[PDB]
Homo-oligomer: A and B are copies of this chain.
Amino acid sequence: TDIQMTQSPSSLSASVGDRVTITCQASQDISNYLIWYQQKPGKAPKLLIYDASNLETGVPSRFSGSGSGTDFTFTISSLQPEDIATYYCQQYHNLPPYTFGPGTKLEIK
């Protein structure tokens, strides 16, 4: 019942306006029970997208996610300066451990 999450790429440099794509893969089927968080240094993870594709109220429409089963995608269209952060997927199918992907550190340039 231990589920591993992998996440790609580990880091990314990009420019304002770019579209960037992050993926994660679960080691077993998790249906769509996957959240994407944004975390800025010294702050707790902030919820962006829950149940793989549901854009949380208050979060800009440039963020989206998709997937069901083992392969998930998170996209930030038209990147803004305030998007600099580390991004994490977390799975919560069935019972804990609700495992996290190792993160993607996004910077400008």
A41, A88, A100 pick with most chain B CB within 10 angstroms:
A100
A51 to B96, CA, bound (A): 8
Query: A101 in the interface, Cβ–Cβ < 8 Å?
Result: yes
Task: Tell me which residues across on chain B come within 8 A of A97, comparing CB atoms.
Answer: 47, 50, 56
Contact count band on A: 20 to 34
A50 to B63, CA, bound (A): 30
A 78-100 contacts with B by CB, 8 A: 88, 92, 96-100
A96–B35 CB distance below 8 A = yes
Task: Tell me which residues across on chain B come within 8 A of A50, comparing CB atoms.
Answer: 96-97
Closest 3 CB pairs of A and B: A50-B96, A44-B100, A47-B97
Interchain Cβ contacts under 8 Å between A and B, 24 examples: A35-B96, A35-B98, A41-B41, A42-B105, A43-B102, A43-B103, A44-B88, A44-B100, A44-B101, A44-B102, A44-B103, A45-B45, A45-B88, A45-B100, A47-B96, A47-B97, A47-B98, A47-B99, A50-B96, A50-B97, A51-B96, A56-B97, A92-B92, A92-B98
